[PDB]
Structures are given as C-alpha cells and as structure tokens.
Amino acid sequence: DPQAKAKLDKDGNYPIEVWCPDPSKNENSRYYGSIQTGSQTPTVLQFSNTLTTVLLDENGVGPLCKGDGLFISCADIVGFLFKTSGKMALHGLPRYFNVTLRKRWV
Amino acid sequence: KPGCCPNVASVPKLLVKGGVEVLSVVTGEDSITQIELYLNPRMGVNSPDLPTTSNWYTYTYDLQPKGSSPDQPIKENLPAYSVARVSLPMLNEDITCDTLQMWEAISVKTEVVGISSLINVHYWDMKRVHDYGAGIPVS
Amino acid sequence: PKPGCCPNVASVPKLLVKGGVEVLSVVTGEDSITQIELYLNPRMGVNSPDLPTTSNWYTYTYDLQPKGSSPDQPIKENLPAYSVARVSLPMLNEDITCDTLQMWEAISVKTEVVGISSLINVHYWDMKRVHDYGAGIPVSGVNYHMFAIGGEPLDLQGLVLDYQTQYPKTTNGGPITIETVLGRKMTPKNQGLDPQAKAKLDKDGNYPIEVWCPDPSKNENSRYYGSIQTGSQTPTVLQFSNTLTTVLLDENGVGPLCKGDGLFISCADIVGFLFKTSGKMALHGLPRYFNVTLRKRWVKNPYPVVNLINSLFSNLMPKVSGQPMEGKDNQVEEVRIYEGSEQLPGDPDIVRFLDKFGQEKTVYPKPS
Amino acid sequence: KNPYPVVNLINSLFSNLMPKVSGQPMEGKDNQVEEVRIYEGSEQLPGDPDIVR
Amino acid sequence: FLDKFGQEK
C-alpha cells in the first residue's frame, strides 16, 4: 500500500513478519538482506573478519547522520530448532557491527 | 636522521581506545573513527529480566498454526527487528558558518557472533532424526 | 662466463635450508622469506591415541544422543574442541639507538584439508544402510571448519545455546566453560553475547565449539576464516588444491605481528556424521595442513624501555604498604605546580587548572 | 658484544604483552611440523624445488 | 628461541 509507511523507533516491537523496508524512502540509509526458507533445508554461513564492505554510492557519499545519530538495526533469525514433543521454535544469533566514521564537510 | 636507521611504513596511529564515555572527544579535521557496536535480537522475549518466563532468550514460543479463523498470535509468538542509535558528539560550535561539518560512515565489517554455537546436536529434548539417534541441529 | 655464448635463465629466490624444525636458528639477512609447514590433529573429544581402550575412536565423539529430560550433561569426551599450537620462532636483533626492533609477520597462508579422500568409505563395518540390503550412507550432514593464524591467540566469548545445562567442570585439566572462567553461576544473559565473558585460549583439547566462537572484537593480530553448513543428511562439498594462496595483509598494509615471537596457529574441523547400524551417530573431524609464510619486518617500539624496566624491580622501585594516597580516600590534600614566573597575581588564593583542550584558564570563584 | 637485544627480551615478562600457551607440541621429539624452508637472496633456477642434499 | 629463557625461581 502506498499509504502504509512506518518508521523504525521501538526496539523489539516492529515484527519482521509484517514489515519490509521501503526502497523509495530509505535513500540515505543502506541495507543488505537475504532469505532462505524451507522445513529441513540446510543453512550456510561464511564468516570472517576481513570482509570489509564499502558503503559509497555512485556519487561518493554515505549514510550522513542527520541529527547526529547513527541509526543501526538488524534481525538475524537463523533457524528452527526442533523438540521431541514435536514443537518447533526459531532461534536467532546476535551480530557484530564495526562501523567506520569519517569527518566530511557539507 | 634518515642516515642509519631502518625505515618503517606509516599507518594511521591510535589516539584513543576505550569504552563509551570517550566518544565525546575533539580531534583534528581528519578522523577514521571506528565503532564496534553489537546488538542481540529482541524477538519473542525482549529482555532476560523477568525470571519465570525467561527460560528462553532470543527465541520464540512454539509456533503452531492455529486451524481456526482467524488466528491471534501472542506477542511472544512472533519475531521482530532490533534497532539501536549510538549517540555522537556535536561537531561545529558556531553553526552560522557557510560550511557545516557532518559525520558519514564509509565501511561496515559485519560478522555473526555465535555462529559456531548452533551445532548443538545434543540437547535435553531435541527431536531425533531416527530411532536411538542424535537430534537434528538448528536448520 | 661469456653472456653471448651461453644461455640465461630467470631469477628465482635461492633455497638456503630445507629440513626439520631445528633450522629456524639460522642467522639470515635483513630481507629473507621463511616458509613453515604445520599440521593439526583435531581434538574431537578423544585427545590422544596413546590410551589403551578409548583409542578405538580417534577424532570421533562417543555416539552422542539427546538425553530426554532437563537438565542435560555431556561427558568430557562428548563435546569437540579446538586445536592450538604455538610454533616457536627465533629471537631477532634490534637497534636501541633508534628504538626499533624487527619481528616476524605472516603474509600468505596456504591451506588444504588432508585426508579428504578418506570420506568415501561406504563399506564401513558398522555404517548403517541407506536403503535396505544395500550400501552405506557416507559422512555428511553437519560440517564445520574454522582455522585461525595470528600473532596472539584468539579472543572468544561465551555463547551457550541453553544456559540451564551444566558441563563437567575441571577436576584435572577438564573442559572449561563460561562458569569456570568467570566462577559465578551462569545467568541467562549469556544465551546471547555478554561483554563480561571474554577469554583467550591456551589449552587445545579443552575449549568446546558448542559454547565458544571466535569473537571479532579484540582480534587485531589474528585472522580467521570459517564456514558452517548444518543439517541432517546434507551434502558437504569442499574443494582442495595446491594453488590457492590466501593473501593476508590489512587495509593498513601489514599483516599479523607475531608478538612475543610466537605464531599462534588455531584450528578446528568437523566434516560429518558417520551413522551406525544401532542408530548412534558421531562427529568426525579431519586434520588440516598449513603453509604459513613469514617475513621479517621492522617496527617501532611503543613502550619506552627506561620507563618500563624501573617498574619491574623491587629494589630499584620499592612498593610500600602505607596509607592511601590515591583513590577515593586520598589524604594528600592540595598540590600546586610552578613553571616560570609571570607578574604578580590578584590573590594567592586563585586557582587555575588545565581544561579538556589543553590551554590554561583562570577559573572564577563562585559562591558555595 | 651482548648476545641478545635488550628491547625484545624484557617484553617476555609482561603476560599481557607476551602470551604462552601449551597447545600441541611444535618442538622437541615427535612433533607435528614437517618442512621448514628459508629463502634468502636470489640465484638461477634449480633443477627442482625439492633438492636432496 | 625466546621461550627457553623463562626458568625463573
């Protein structure tokens, strides 16, 4: 719907099941996402500490902190774990973020 | 002197390490300011404080599709995001100038901590794959 | 020696020694290149093969099952572990008059998993059949490999999957956990990460994968690569070759510095479940091969040695158990300092102090 | 002339600066390190990089 | 080898 556009304020009160980021609005912010689903499908994660990711656009800017607050946000639901009672529940892993800032004239 | 001494390469030097109370610091015109932030996912159980129901942390309660219209999921039953806002110092003291100063991020070096933790094939009620076998891992 | 009457070849770096471990002592020039090759047997719950009866399984856990009732407790030989090996390095010369020392640095790590052809043993004498009256289901499902080269050992943090379960505490060299390294009984806050649960790793067959993961907060001198792919009977594809050389420099341009002249290698590997006819299954690892390459690099010593060496001796610097002169209950009351001489101030009760920026500022007496 | 540099020598005492782990044996008898090469200088190409001496 | 110095008593 073109008239259903919220923002991201509360910590654990915006469900991922009913929200998905709006690409026409978030012109200043950047976001990288993925999805893989299925019942007994495997998950695969590669991880390192030298996978330095640039954030520069096609014109050479970044996420300029309007209001001097770096909004950072994620959710990293990684899999179901099963139970011998037949019950299922999903488990998530926390994430490490290493943001590099720089002074730039405006 | 550059006569008799081995020459070494130049790297951007440290000035300040430490915790959160030292963000409020002034520097020169240049900075490669790094922030090592983390956040754990507030989904289902948003805080480990209340004792009698924080048996699970970073989990949901058991997802069951209901079978009767309509459904009504619990607050515990559905996942969510996790937002955070690090605070940053003010840059320009006199904002009457023609050229304001403003902070911009350029690099993120993300990684999933606890990634090797999820291979817990032994658990106290994990669902077995077959008879007398080990339970399946997180998938 | 005539160049026009004899062919010429390319220029290749000259071999100087090829041999065992005891040839790191060779005095080399200012610009050498050192290649050293390692291998690490994985400690998959069974740490040593010399044991008389329990060495029937080497690099295998002992047929793990879910318990069925809270709380669970595994055996010492149930959980797998990492594998560390501090390889030795020689001591290298310095230059005190310019305050520079040289020290080792890794540049390129070549790696491969040896024994990778031992996976396809589908005629194993206890392996269960995938179809009835047929062949065996090969090693598959969960694989996990994570190596780490570096000048310091890794920094790794507590990330248990269920805080309620209890682990066998160290009665003699046992596998230590969060509750051993902190001492107090573990909270549910360490279900997710917790910055008061850091640890370094010193014991190879004792730190379990199941609760401990290499945390990238404090690992500026250690690089590590890792991959998970988990499931019941999922395929596991791992390529291996003789020509993939991982360059390991930084954004700044220099690699890991072997501080203390030790190169702390770190390794772990799990490649599959082998299934048994009774239904019991077990984690099985593989040993890795390393070919880390070293080069001598000059640095600058950040610690002034004359400021450091006095703090060490009891006779040159005596420590005394007096009355508290710093902290909350300081009995030293007021200290001035005088530098130079300006003209006479307004009253000797005036007080100055340096600001945050670093310039002098006569503070103004406010009523109180 | 002294055998050892005084700079790197004192750094071995401070345990925050010089760590020491047990690990697996990389020295002595029956260790798990196979081949160590030393490359210094440059010359013409040998017949193979596996010269037996 | 720099680890062989420490035998302190």
Of B123, B39, B49, A77, the C-alpha closest to C188 is: B49
Amino acid identity of residue B59, one-letter, is Y
CB-side neighbour CA atoms (13 Å) of C358: 3
Are C33 and C13 spatial neighbours (Cβ–Cβ below 8 Å)? yes
Of B57, B107, B104, the C-alpha closest to C163 is: B57
Is it the case that chain C and chain E have 3 or more CB pairs lying under 8 Å apart? yes
Instruction: Name the residue of chain C whose CA is nearest to A47's CA.
Output: C226
d(CA C170, CA C174): 4
d(CA C293, CA C33): 7
- Four-CA torsion C184, C190, C195, C197, nearest 10 degrees: 40
Q: How far is CA C280 from CA B67, C19, C128, C277, in A?
A: 37, 44, 10, 7
**Can you read off the two tokens belonging to residue B108?**
């993120």
CB-side neighbour CA atoms (13 Å) of C306: 3
Cis peptide before C153 (omega within 30 of 0): no
How buried is residue C61: exposed, middle or buried, by Cβ count under 10 Å (0-12/13-18/19+)? buried
- At which residue do the structure tokens 């610009």 appear? C31
Residues 6+ apart with CB under 8 A from C322: none
CA C157 to chain centre: 12
* Distance between start and end Cα atoms, chain B: 62
Flag if B34 and A8 touch (Cβ within 8 Å). Answer: no
Angle at alpha carbon of residue B11, lines to B7 and B17, rounded to 5°: 130
Residues 6+ apart with CB under 8 A from B106: A54, A55, A56, A62, A100, A101, A102
**Can you read off the two tokens belonging to residue B100?**
């304001």
Angle at alpha carbon of residue B70, lines to B64 and B73, rounded to 5°: 45
Helix (H) or strand (E) holding C246: strand C245-247
Of C289, C291, C285, C290, the C-alpha closest to C42 is: C285
Instruction: Name the residue of chain B whose CA is nearest to C189's CA.
Output: B48
- Torsion sign, CA atoms A81, A45, C41, C24: negative
Flag if D27 and E2 touch (Cβ within 8 Å). Answer: no
Are B114 and A93 spatial neighbours (Cβ–Cβ below 8 Å)? yes
Q: How far is CA E8 from CA C264, D6, E2, in A?
A: 23, 18, 14
Are C238 and C139 spatial neighbours (Cβ–Cβ below 8 Å)? no
Amino acid identity of residue C260, one-letter, is G
Are A81 and B126 spatial neighbours (Cβ–Cβ below 8 Å)? yes
**Can you read off the two tokens belonging to residue C161?**
């999957």
**Can you read off the two tokens belonging to residue B63?**
């997802």
**Can you read off the two tokens belonging to residue B73?**
């999921």
Instruction: Name the residue of chain C whose CA is nearest to A52's CA.
Output: C251
**Can you read off the two tokens belonging to residue A66?**
């309007």
Chains touching B (at least 3 CB pairs under 8 A) are: A, C
d(CA C267, CA C82): 6
Flag if D37 and C17 touch (Cβ within 8 Å). Answer: yes
* Distance between start and end Cα atoms, chain A: 35
Residues 6+ apart with CB under 8 A from C306: none
Are B32 and A102 spatial neighbours (Cβ–Cβ below 8 Å)? yes
CB-side neighbour CA atoms (13 Å) of B86: 25
Three-class secondary structure of residue C94 per DSSP:
strand
Cis peptide before C71 (omega within 30 of 0): yes
Flag if A96 and C228 touch (Cβ within 8 Å). Answer: no
Are C18 and D35 spatial neighbours (Cβ–Cβ below 8 Å)? yes
Are C211 and C122 spatial neighbours (Cβ–Cβ below 8 Å)? no
Q: How far is D2 from chain C (nearest CA, A)?
A: 11
Residues 6+ apart with CB under 8 A from B37: A72, A97, A98, A99, B84, B86
d(CA C91, CA A35): 51
Are D39 and C36 spatial neighbours (Cβ–Cβ below 8 Å)? no
* Distance between start and end Cα atoms, chain D: 35
Neighbours of C73 (CB within 10 A): 12
Ordered by start, the domain boundaries in chain C are 3-300
d(CA C190, CA B37): 17
Instruction: Record the resolution, in angstroms.
Output: 3.4
Pairing of strands C155-158, C198-200: antiparallel
Is it the case that chain C and chain A have 3 or more CB pairs lying under 8 Å apart? yes
- Torsion sign, CA atoms D47, D50, D52, D53: positive
**Can you read off the two tokens belonging to residue C160?**
């248990």
Flag if D8 and E1 touch (Cβ within 8 Å). Answer: no
Of B42, B50, B38, B112, the C-alpha closest to A15 is: B42
Q: Chain D: which residues have CB within 8 Å of chain E?
A: 8-9, 12, 20, 27
CA B24 to chain centre: 22
Q: How far is CA C100 from CA B50, C94, C303, E5, in A?
A: 56, 6, 11, 22
CA C228 to chain centre: 19
Are D45 and C15 spatial neighbours (Cβ–Cβ below 8 Å)? no
Helix (H) or strand (E) holding A45: strand A43-48
Which residue among B12, B120, B134 places its CB closest to the CB of C65? B134
Helix (H) or strand (E) holding C306: helix C305-309
Amino acid identity of residue C115, one-letter, is G
Are C315 and C309 spatial neighbours (Cβ–Cβ below 8 Å)? no
**Can you read off the two tokens belonging to residue C222?**
């250690």
Three-class secondary structure of residue C317 per DSSP:
coil
Are B111 and A96 spatial neighbours (Cβ–Cβ below 8 Å)? yes
- At which residue do the structure tokens 């190169």 appear? C263
Length of chain E: 9
